Amino acid sequence: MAPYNETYASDYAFAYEGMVSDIAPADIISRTVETSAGIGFGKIVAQGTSDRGCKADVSAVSPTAPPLGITVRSQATENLTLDKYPRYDGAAIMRKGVIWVLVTDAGGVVAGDPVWLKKSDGTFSNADVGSSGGLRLAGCRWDTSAANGALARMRVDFDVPPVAGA
């Protein structure tokens, strides 16, 4: 009977942090979490050192060492970390479907835009940062107009090599 965090919303929300939207194709890949803390749901991941592991640290990704994919919302995750994949757990990375993610940009994004990754934190945006600290995920595009700090769905394809931007 818990009425806390009641906002009396006008209508239903759109999605959650890492939920997918149904479509026939999806590469979902099982990896093992390597970071000491968990990994959030809609997040980018790099290639681990365990030959099948992944890390949440993408500060050193390059066109030669591209990022691995994006985690998905699992909803059965050990109930000790709130919404995360705990250490030593199947990660369920996705690299082909359409997924809801979080926007980090001042002016927001619109339907068809490039997707730029900020290597410092691992956040998605519309344009390059400008100090050799951003990559462009070459095969990727948005699918929703959204403001700053809101959820937008994007279409992703990680087999296309990334592009470095200074």
Binding site: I28, S30, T32, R52, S74, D89, G90, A92
Partner: protein, 52 residues
């Protein structure tokens, strides 16, 4: 007969850690093999003369 040959077989696979609805599930496989040997002919015999 000329040769003797005969048959064997072996299989190969690997299992892995997977979780959370992913399509990644590994697979196994099988094989077979044949091997051969040969067979040859030899001989010995005697003789004698008419006055032996």
């Amino acid at each position: 007969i000329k040769t003797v040959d005969y048959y064997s077989m072996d299989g190969v696979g690997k299992a892995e850690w997977i979780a959370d609805r992913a399509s990644d599930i590994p697979v196994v496989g099988l094989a077979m093999e044949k091997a051969t040997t040969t067979v040859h002919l030899a001989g010995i015999g005697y003789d004698y003369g008419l006055e032996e």
